[PDB]
Amino acid sequence: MENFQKVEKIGEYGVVYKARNKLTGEVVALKKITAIREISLLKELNHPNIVKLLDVIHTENKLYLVFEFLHQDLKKFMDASALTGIPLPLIKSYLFQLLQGLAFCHSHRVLHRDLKPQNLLINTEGAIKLADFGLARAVVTLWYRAPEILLGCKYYSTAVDIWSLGCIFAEMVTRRALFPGDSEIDQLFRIFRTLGTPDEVVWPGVTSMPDYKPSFPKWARQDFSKVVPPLDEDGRSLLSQMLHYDPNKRISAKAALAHPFFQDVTKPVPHLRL
Ligand SMILES: CN(C)CCCNS(=O)(=O)c1ccc(Nc2nccc(-c3cnc4cccnn34)n2)cc1
């Protein structure tokens, strides 16, 4: 690690730093944290929409991960685009690319588990990539947590990543977080108030989940025309399938890529202020 010089703090698994390789002049993203094996497995998991894991350094009982450096994260970009909003064509491009990244990771049996604007990175060329993948297996925000996780499911599936991405999708479109909960129960009830309290009809087996309680209030479902007004009908049908209660009914990344919404997708370049 004496080969790297910290430049600035990026965020805080561990803390992430923007650093410089004094043995190449290369700029990278440095994260300071059975594990060794799992981590080494992610270094082979390469794709255009996944932040590349360059090296793993295990020393002094400490674990350091070296990642390629990207220009800005989605949280900052959304804040910067708050006045006029991100153009629809760019929103569509970002969603399409992220679905490609998830389709790839999911085909390799790897899930993210904690997708959020903060770990989605973009560059001046118009690309977007997933970061902090698989690490989630080797104050925190609950806004993007899938309902099966909140209800105590022990062995959830790749479907949890689709739910998180759907929430991010809605947020780029409306400039408002879909389910901004500040506690697990508040998060769960916010989802219920919008999508309706789930029951055995729409979600077989839900009433027998670890944290489900017959005493839950029973709210009715709302129309998506009210949830995401500026989104056209193809966008709304796609979003509804990404937000299905039953993990088994929720659309897969692969199936989503074939949805009508993407028939006119393109790759615009963002206006980034660095
Ligand atoms: C809270 N504010 C002070 C803003 C914080 C910084 N936001 S930013 O858009 O300037 C900005 C954010 C990120 C970058 N680069 C960059 N490249 C590659 C990776 C990462 C990055 C971030 N978490 C993680 C977690 C794991 C792995 N990688 N990894 N980050 C540049 C700029």
Side-chain angles (χ1 to χ4, degrees), residues 1-4 7-8 10-12 14-22 25-36 38-43 45-59 63-108 110-153 155-272 274:
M1 293 325 289
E2 83 280 331
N3 291 178
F4 296 82
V7 177
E8 304 185 307
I10 290 179
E12 304 176 10
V15 188
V16 190
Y17 298 99
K18 174 179 182 178
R20 167 104 54 184
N21 183 311
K22 297 184 296 182
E26 182 176 58
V27 170
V28 299
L30 188 64
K31 187 183 182 184
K32 180 184 177 181
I33 299 176
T34 178
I36 297 176
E38 301 186 303
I39 303 300
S40 294
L41 232 61
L42 291 175
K43 194 178 145 191
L45 185 74
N46 311 273
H47 183 281
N49 299 116
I50 298 177
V51 176
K52 184 178 181 182
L53 177 54
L54 304 176
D55 289 88
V56 180
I57 301 176
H58 186 13
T59 55
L63 187 61
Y64 292 95
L65 298 179
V66 186
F67 295 97
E68 68 172 310
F69 182 76
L70 270 84
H71 322 335
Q72 191 167 95
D73 70 40
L74 190 60
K75 179 64 178 66
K76 181 172 180 175
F77 185 59
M78 278 194 279
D79 284 345
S81 303
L83 296 191
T84 61
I86 303 172
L88 174 58
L90 185 55
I91 292 177
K92 183 174 299 191
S93 175
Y94 282 172
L95 180 62
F96 190 66
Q97 290 179 67
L98 292 176
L99 283 169
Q100 282 180 274
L102 289 185
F104 174 86
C105 63
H106 290 173
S107 67
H108 284 78
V110 176
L111 28 169
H112 189 295
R113 309 166 188 283
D114 194 30
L115 285 180
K116 47 188 175 187
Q118 298 58 45
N119 51 42
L120 296 182
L121 293 301
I122 63 176
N123 63 27
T124 53
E125 317 299 348
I128 185 163
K129 309 186 178 188
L130 300 152
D132 235 349
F133 224 128
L135 284 79
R137 185 251 242 290
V139 183
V140 299
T141 184
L142 301 168
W143 300 3
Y144 315 94
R145 285 290 159 68
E148 56 266 39
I149 296 180
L150 299 169
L151 288 174
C153 184
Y155 312 90
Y156 47 90
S157 70
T158 53
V160 304
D161 292 333
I162 295 298
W163 175 282
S164 299
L165 185 57
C167 290
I168 296 169
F169 179 21
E171 185 170 348
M172 286 191 276
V173 171
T174 67
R175 281 177 268 171
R176 279 273 187 268
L178 186 50
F179 308 120
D182 61 347
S183 74
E184 285 197 55
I185 196 63
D186 182 57
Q187 185 65 40
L188 192 64
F189 287 176
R190 277 174 176 282
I191 296 171
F192 290 0
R193 287 195 279 287
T194 295
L195 304 180
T197 298
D199 59 9
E200 288 295 320
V201 176
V202 298
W203 190 355
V206 66
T207 63
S208 62
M209 294 184 78
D211 299 347
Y212 173 82
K213 292 180 166 60
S215 49
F216 279 162
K218 276 172 187 122
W219 289 284
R221 183 186 183 83
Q222 295 183 54
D223 300 304
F224 271 36
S225 58
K226 180 182 176 185
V227 185
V228 290
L231 196 59
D232 60 65
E233 199 57 40
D234 280 325
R236 296 179 185 174
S237 68
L238 173 55
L239 180 62
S240 70
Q241 299 194 119
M242 292 176 81
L243 296 182
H244 270 321
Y245 271 118
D246 191 336
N248 295 297
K249 293 185 178 63
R250 205 171 300 152
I251 195 167
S252 67
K254 177 181 181 175
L257 291 171
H259 188 103
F261 188 61
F262 299 115
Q263 251 110 69
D264 65 346
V265 66
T266 63
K267 187 181 181 178
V269 291
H271 174 53
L272 295 187
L274 308 175

mmCIF file of all heavy atoms in Angstrom, residues 9-11 16 18 28-29 31 51 67-77 118-119 121 131-133 135, ligand 1, unseen atoms left out:
data_model
loop_
_atom_site.group_PDB
_atom_site.id
_atom_site.type_symbol
_atom_site.label_atom_id
_atom_site.label_comp_id
_atom_site.label_asym_id
_atom_site.label_seq_id
_atom_site.Cartn_x
_atom_site.Cartn_y
_atom_site.Cartn_z
ATOM 1 N N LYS A 9 -11.269 11.526 -0.377
ATOM 2 C CA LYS A 9 -12.223 10.520 0.066
ATOM 3 C C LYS A 9 -13.426 10.527 -0.871
ATOM 4 O O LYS A 9 -13.949 11.587 -1.216
ATOM 5 C CB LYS A 9 -12.669 10.810 1.495
ATOM 6 N N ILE A 10 -13.857 9.338 -1.282
ATOM 7 C CA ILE A 10 -14.992 9.194 -2.185
ATOM 8 C C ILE A 10 -16.273 8.845 -1.433
ATOM 9 O O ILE A 10 -17.351 9.344 -1.757
ATOM 10 C CB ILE A 10 -14.723 8.094 -3.235
ATOM 11 C CG1 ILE A 10 -13.654 8.569 -4.219
ATOM 12 C CG2 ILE A 10 -16.011 7.728 -3.964
ATOM 13 C CD1 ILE A 10 -13.308 7.546 -5.288
ATOM 14 N N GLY A 11 -16.149 7.980 -0.431
ATOM 15 C CA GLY A 11 -17.311 7.578 0.341
ATOM 16 C C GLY A 11 -16.962 6.604 1.446
ATOM 17 O O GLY A 11 -15.808 6.201 1.585
ATOM 18 N N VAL A 16 -13.852 4.167 0.841
ATOM 19 C CA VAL A 16 -13.306 4.225 -0.515
ATOM 20 C C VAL A 16 -12.575 5.544 -0.756
ATOM 21 O O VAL A 16 -13.060 6.616 -0.394
ATOM 22 C CB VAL A 16 -14.408 4.062 -1.576
ATOM 23 C CG1 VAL A 16 -13.772 3.893 -2.951
ATOM 24 C CG2 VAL A 16 -15.285 2.857 -1.242
ATOM 25 N N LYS A 18 -9.949 7.991 -3.552
ATOM 26 C CA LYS A 18 -9.459 8.240 -4.901
ATOM 27 C C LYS A 18 -7.952 8.261 -4.645
ATOM 28 O O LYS A 18 -7.489 8.988 -3.767
ATOM 29 C CB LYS A 18 -9.894 9.604 -5.447
ATOM 30 C CG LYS A 18 -9.253 9.912 -6.810
ATOM 31 C CD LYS A 18 -9.697 11.252 -7.371
ATOM 32 C CE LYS A 18 -9.076 11.506 -8.738
ATOM 33 N NZ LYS A 18 -9.511 12.795 -9.358
ATOM 34 N N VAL A 28 -6.789 5.519 -9.465
ATOM 35 C CA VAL A 28 -7.705 4.419 -9.162
ATOM 36 C C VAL A 28 -8.639 4.714 -7.989
ATOM 37 O O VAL A 28 -8.532 5.752 -7.337
ATOM 38 C CB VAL A 28 -6.923 3.138 -8.782
ATOM 39 C CG1 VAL A 28 -6.035 2.701 -9.932
ATOM 40 C CG2 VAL A 28 -6.081 3.401 -7.527
ATOM 41 N N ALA A 29 -9.563 3.790 -7.742
ATOM 42 C CA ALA A 29 -10.483 3.895 -6.615
ATOM 43 C C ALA A 29 -10.020 2.809 -5.647
ATOM 44 O O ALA A 29 -9.978 1.634 -6.008
ATOM 45 C CB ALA A 29 -11.916 3.632 -7.058
ATOM 46 N N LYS A 31 -10.511 0.773 -2.025
ATOM 47 C CA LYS A 31 -11.402 0.456 -0.918
ATOM 48 C C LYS A 31 -10.651 -0.311 0.165
ATOM 49 O O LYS A 31 -10.031 -1.342 -0.103
ATOM 50 C CB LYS A 31 -12.594 -0.375 -1.396
ATOM 51 C CG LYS A 31 -13.642 -0.595 -0.304
ATOM 52 C CD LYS A 31 -14.787 -1.485 -0.773
ATOM 53 C CE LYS A 31 -15.833 -1.646 0.323
ATOM 54 N NZ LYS A 31 -16.914 -2.586 -0.073
ATOM 55 N N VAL A 51 -17.724 -2.223 -12.910
ATOM 56 C CA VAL A 51 -16.460 -1.575 -12.560
ATOM 57 C C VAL A 51 -15.378 -2.649 -12.376
ATOM 58 O O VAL A 51 -15.524 -3.560 -11.565
ATOM 59 C CB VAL A 51 -16.608 -0.743 -11.263
ATOM 60 C CG1 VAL A 51 -15.267 -0.156 -10.858
ATOM 61 C CG2 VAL A 51 -17.612 0.383 -11.487
ATOM 62 N N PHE A 67 -9.740 -0.625 -7.722
ATOM 63 C CA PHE A 67 -10.719 -0.550 -8.809
ATOM 64 C C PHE A 67 -10.343 0.506 -9.850
ATOM 65 O O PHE A 67 -9.643 1.471 -9.543
ATOM 66 C CB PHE A 67 -12.092 -0.177 -8.234
ATOM 67 C CG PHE A 67 -12.678 -1.219 -7.323
ATOM 68 C CD1 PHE A 67 -12.540 -1.113 -5.944
ATOM 69 C CD2 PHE A 67 -13.382 -2.300 -7.845
ATOM 70 C CE1 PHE A 67 -13.102 -2.064 -5.093
ATOM 71 C CE2 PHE A 67 -13.951 -3.260 -7.000
ATOM 72 C CZ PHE A 67 -13.811 -3.141 -5.625
ATOM 73 N N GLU A 68 -10.812 0.324 -11.081
ATOM 74 C CA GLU A 68 -10.574 1.319 -12.125
ATOM 75 C C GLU A 68 -11.350 2.548 -11.623
ATOM 76 O O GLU A 68 -12.309 2.395 -10.863
ATOM 77 C CB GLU A 68 -11.159 0.844 -13.463
ATOM 78 C CG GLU A 68 -12.689 0.771 -13.496
ATOM 79 C CD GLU A 68 -13.249 0.496 -14.885
ATOM 80 O OE1 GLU A 68 -12.848 1.193 -15.843
ATOM 81 O OE2 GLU A 68 -14.092 -0.413 -15.024
ATOM 82 N N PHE A 69 -10.945 3.747 -12.034
ATOM 83 C CA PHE A 69 -11.608 4.983 -11.598
ATOM 84 C C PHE A 69 -12.572 5.537 -12.645
ATOM 85 O O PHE A 69 -12.220 5.649 -13.821
ATOM 86 C CB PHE A 69 -10.555 6.068 -11.303
ATOM 87 C CG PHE A 69 -11.129 7.373 -10.805
ATOM 88 C CD1 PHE A 69 -11.582 7.494 -9.494
ATOM 89 C CD2 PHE A 69 -11.204 8.484 -11.643
ATOM 90 C CE1 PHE A 69 -12.098 8.696 -9.020
ATOM 91 C CE2 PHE A 69 -11.720 9.697 -11.181
ATOM 92 C CZ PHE A 69 -12.167 9.804 -9.866
ATOM 93 N N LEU A 70 -13.790 5.856 -12.215
ATOM 94 C CA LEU A 70 -14.772 6.481 -13.096
ATOM 95 C C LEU A 70 -14.970 7.920 -12.635
ATOM 96 O O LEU A 70 -14.622 8.273 -11.512
ATOM 97 C CB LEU A 70 -16.101 5.732 -13.104
ATOM 98 C CG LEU A 70 -16.078 4.666 -14.198
ATOM 99 C CD1 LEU A 70 -15.403 3.419 -13.643
ATOM 100 C CD2 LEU A 70 -17.491 4.347 -14.680
ATOM 101 N N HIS A 71 -15.574 8.728 -13.501
ATOM 102 C CA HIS A 71 -15.739 10.159 -13.272
ATOM 103 C C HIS A 71 -16.744 10.720 -12.261
ATOM 104 O O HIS A 71 -16.476 11.759 -11.648
ATOM 105 C CB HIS A 71 -15.974 10.829 -14.633
ATOM 106 C CG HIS A 71 -15.155 10.240 -15.745
ATOM 107 N ND1 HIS A 71 -13.959 9.591 -15.525
ATOM 108 C CD2 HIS A 71 -15.354 10.222 -17.084
ATOM 109 C CE1 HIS A 71 -13.456 9.197 -16.684
ATOM 110 N NE2 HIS A 71 -14.282 9.567 -17.645
ATOM 111 N N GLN A 72 -17.896 10.073 -12.094
ATOM 112 C CA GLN A 72 -18.925 10.585 -11.172
ATOM 113 C C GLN A 72 -19.925 9.485 -10.825
ATOM 114 O O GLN A 72 -20.047 8.517 -11.575
ATOM 115 C CB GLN A 72 -19.659 11.759 -11.852
ATOM 116 C CG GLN A 72 -20.581 12.587 -10.948
ATOM 117 C CD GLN A 72 -21.006 13.903 -11.597
ATOM 118 O OE1 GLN A 72 -22.072 13.998 -12.210
ATOM 119 N NE2 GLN A 72 -20.157 14.921 -11.478
ATOM 120 N N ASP A 73 -20.628 9.614 -9.693
ATOM 121 C CA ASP A 73 -21.638 8.605 -9.348
ATOM 122 C C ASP A 73 -23.033 9.138 -9.689
ATOM 123 O O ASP A 73 -23.207 10.339 -9.899
ATOM 124 C CB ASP A 73 -21.516 8.141 -7.874
ATOM 125 C CG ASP A 73 -21.928 9.200 -6.851
ATOM 126 O OD1 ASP A 73 -22.916 9.929 -7.065
ATOM 127 O OD2 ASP A 73 -21.257 9.267 -5.799
ATOM 128 N N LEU A 74 -24.008 8.239 -9.791
ATOM 129 C CA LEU A 74 -25.366 8.617 -10.177
ATOM 130 C C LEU A 74 -26.095 9.517 -9.185
ATOM 131 O O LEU A 74 -26.947 10.317 -9.578
ATOM 132 C CB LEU A 74 -26.199 7.363 -10.453
ATOM 133 C CG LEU A 74 -27.563 7.626 -11.099
ATOM 134 C CD1 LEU A 74 -27.383 8.319 -12.452
ATOM 135 C CD2 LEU A 74 -28.315 6.299 -11.258
ATOM 136 N N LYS A 75 -25.780 9.380 -7.903
ATOM 137 C CA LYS A 75 -26.409 10.226 -6.894
ATOM 138 C C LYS A 75 -26.066 11.690 -7.184
ATOM 139 O O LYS A 75 -26.953 12.547 -7.227
ATOM 140 C CB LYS A 75 -25.917 9.840 -5.491
ATOM 141 C CG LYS A 75 -26.497 10.694 -4.358
ATOM 142 C CD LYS A 75 -28.003 10.525 -4.247
ATOM 143 C CE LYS A 75 -28.590 11.341 -3.096
ATOM 144 N NZ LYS A 75 -28.475 12.808 -3.318
ATOM 145 N N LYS A 76 -24.782 11.975 -7.391
ATOM 146 C CA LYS A 76 -24.338 13.337 -7.672
ATOM 147 C C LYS A 76 -24.928 13.858 -8.983
ATOM 148 O O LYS A 76 -25.350 15.016 -9.061
ATOM 149 C CB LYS A 76 -22.803 13.396 -7.715
ATOM 150 C CG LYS A 76 -22.232 14.795 -7.975
ATOM 151 C CD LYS A 76 -20.712 14.806 -7.806
ATOM 152 C CE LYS A 76 -20.130 16.185 -8.056
ATOM 153 N NZ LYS A 76 -18.663 16.213 -7.771
ATOM 154 N N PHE A 77 -24.970 13.006 -10.006
ATOM 155 C CA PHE A 77 -25.522 13.402 -11.299
ATOM 156 C C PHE A 77 -27.014 13.732 -11.176
ATOM 157 O O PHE A 77 -27.482 14.713 -11.752
ATOM 158 C CB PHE A 77 -25.314 12.292 -12.339
ATOM 159 C CG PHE A 77 -25.759 12.664 -13.732
ATOM 160 C CD1 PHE A 77 -25.202 13.758 -14.392
ATOM 161 C CD2 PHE A 77 -26.719 11.907 -14.393
ATOM 162 C CE1 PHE A 77 -25.595 14.086 -15.689
ATOM 163 C CE2 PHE A 77 -27.119 12.227 -15.691
ATOM 164 C CZ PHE A 77 -26.556 13.318 -16.340
ATOM 165 N N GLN A 118 -25.512 5.684 -5.246
ATOM 166 C CA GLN A 118 -24.132 5.868 -4.788
ATOM 167 C C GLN A 118 -23.128 4.856 -5.358
ATOM 168 O O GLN A 118 -21.932 5.169 -5.455
ATOM 169 C CB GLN A 118 -24.082 5.821 -3.254
ATOM 170 C CG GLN A 118 -24.871 6.910 -2.530
ATOM 171 C CD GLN A 118 -26.345 6.920 -2.885
ATOM 172 O OE1 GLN A 118 -27.002 5.878 -2.937
ATOM 173 N NE2 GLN A 118 -26.879 8.111 -3.121
ATOM 174 N N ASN A 119 -23.571 3.645 -5.713
ATOM 175 C CA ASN A 119 -22.620 2.686 -6.284
ATOM 176 C C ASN A 119 -22.804 2.423 -7.777
ATOM 177 O O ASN A 119 -22.412 1.377 -8.291
ATOM 178 C CB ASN A 119 -22.562 1.351 -5.513
ATOM 179 C CG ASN A 119 -23.918 0.732 -5.278
ATOM 180 O OD1 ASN A 119 -24.770 0.718 -6.160
ATOM 181 N ND2 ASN A 119 -24.114 0.186 -4.077
ATOM 182 N N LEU A 121 -21.707 4.119 -11.263
ATOM 183 C CA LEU A 121 -20.729 5.074 -11.787
ATOM 184 C C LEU A 121 -20.849 5.375 -13.277
ATOM 185 O O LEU A 121 -21.072 4.473 -14.078
ATOM 186 C CB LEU A 121 -19.321 4.550 -11.514
ATOM 187 C CG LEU A 121 -18.844 4.457 -10.062
ATOM 188 C CD1 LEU A 121 -18.894 5.846 -9.431
ATOM 189 C CD2 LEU A 121 -19.701 3.475 -9.265
ATOM 190 N N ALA A 131 -20.919 -1.119 -9.315
ATOM 191 C CA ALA A 131 -19.762 -1.194 -8.418
ATOM 192 C C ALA A 131 -20.158 -1.809 -7.076
ATOM 193 O O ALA A 131 -21.307 -1.702 -6.657
ATOM 194 C CB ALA A 131 -19.190 0.198 -8.199
ATOM 195 N N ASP A 132 -19.193 -2.440 -6.411
ATOM 196 C CA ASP A 132 -19.411 -3.078 -5.118
ATOM 197 C C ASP A 132 -20.255 -4.368 -5.266
ATOM 198 O O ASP A 132 -21.019 -4.712 -4.370
ATOM 199 C CB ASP A 132 -20.118 -2.105 -4.163
ATOM 200 C CG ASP A 132 -19.359 -1.907 -2.844
ATOM 201 O OD1 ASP A 132 -18.408 -2.669 -2.561
ATOM 202 O OD2 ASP A 132 -19.725 -0.991 -2.080
ATOM 203 N N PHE A 133 -20.090 -5.074 -6.387
ATOM 204 C CA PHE A 133 -20.810 -6.305 -6.733
ATOM 205 C C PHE A 133 -20.160 -7.496 -6.039
ATOM 206 O O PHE A 133 -18.943 -7.602 -5.902
ATOM 207 C CB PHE A 133 -20.732 -6.527 -8.241
ATOM 208 C CG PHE A 133 -22.035 -6.936 -8.863
ATOM 209 C CD1 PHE A 133 -22.526 -6.247 -9.961
ATOM 210 C CD2 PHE A 133 -22.770 -8.012 -8.360
ATOM 211 C CE1 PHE A 133 -23.722 -6.608 -10.559
ATOM 212 C CE2 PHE A 133 -23.972 -8.383 -8.955
ATOM 213 C CZ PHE A 133 -24.448 -7.679 -10.056
ATOM 214 N N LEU A 135 -19.395 -8.160 -3.352
ATOM 215 C CA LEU A 135 -18.777 -7.874 -2.077
ATOM 216 C C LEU A 135 -19.796 -8.084 -0.979
ATOM 217 O O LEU A 135 -19.454 -8.544 0.104
ATOM 218 C CB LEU A 135 -18.251 -6.438 -2.036
ATOM 219 C CG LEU A 135 -16.949 -6.135 -2.789
ATOM 220 C CD1 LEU A 135 -17.251 -5.991 -4.268
ATOM 221 C CD2 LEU A 135 -16.299 -4.850 -2.263
HETATM 222 C C1 LIG B 1 -20.749 12.899 -0.671
HETATM 223 N N1 LIG B 1 -20.144 13.906 -1.608
HETATM 224 C C2 LIG B 1 -19.079 14.686 -0.918
HETATM 225 C C3 LIG B 1 -19.722 13.301 -2.924
HETATM 226 C C4 LIG B 1 -18.863 12.003 -2.884
HETATM 227 C C5 LIG B 1 -18.212 11.675 -4.234
HETATM 228 N N2 LIG B 1 -19.238 11.469 -5.280
HETATM 229 S S1 LIG B 1 -18.619 11.816 -6.868
HETATM 230 O O1 LIG B 1 -19.847 11.950 -7.864
HETATM 231 O O2 LIG B 1 -17.786 13.161 -6.849
HETATM 232 C C6 LIG B 1 -17.621 10.484 -7.371
HETATM 233 C C7 LIG B 1 -17.939 9.182 -6.931
HETATM 234 C C8 LIG B 1 -17.153 8.105 -7.370
HETATM 235 C C9 LIG B 1 -16.041 8.319 -8.254
HETATM 236 N N3 LIG B 1 -15.219 7.244 -8.760
HETATM 237 C C10 LIG B 1 -15.206 5.809 -8.617
HETATM 238 N N4 LIG B 1 -14.609 5.040 -9.534
HETATM 239 C C11 LIG B 1 -14.636 3.706 -9.366
HETATM 240 C C12 LIG B 1 -15.280 3.112 -8.246
HETATM 241 C C13 LIG B 1 -15.903 4.004 -7.299
HETATM 242 C C14 LIG B 1 -16.575 3.497 -6.142
HETATM 243 C C15 LIG B 1 -17.449 4.243 -5.246
HETATM 244 N N5 LIG B 1 -17.954 3.462 -4.190
HETATM 245 C C16 LIG B 1 -17.353 2.279 -4.517
HETATM 246 C C17 LIG B 1 -17.525 0.952 -3.708
HETATM 247 C C18 LIG B 1 -16.824 -0.156 -4.171
HETATM 248 C C19 LIG B 1 -16.032 -0.131 -5.313
HETATM 249 N N6 LIG B 1 -15.882 0.978 -6.026
HETATM 250 N N7 LIG B 1 -16.478 2.197 -5.602
HETATM 251 N N8 LIG B 1 -15.840 5.346 -7.527
HETATM 252 C C20 LIG B 1 -15.733 9.645 -8.673
HETATM 253 C C21 LIG B 1 -16.522 10.733 -8.234
#
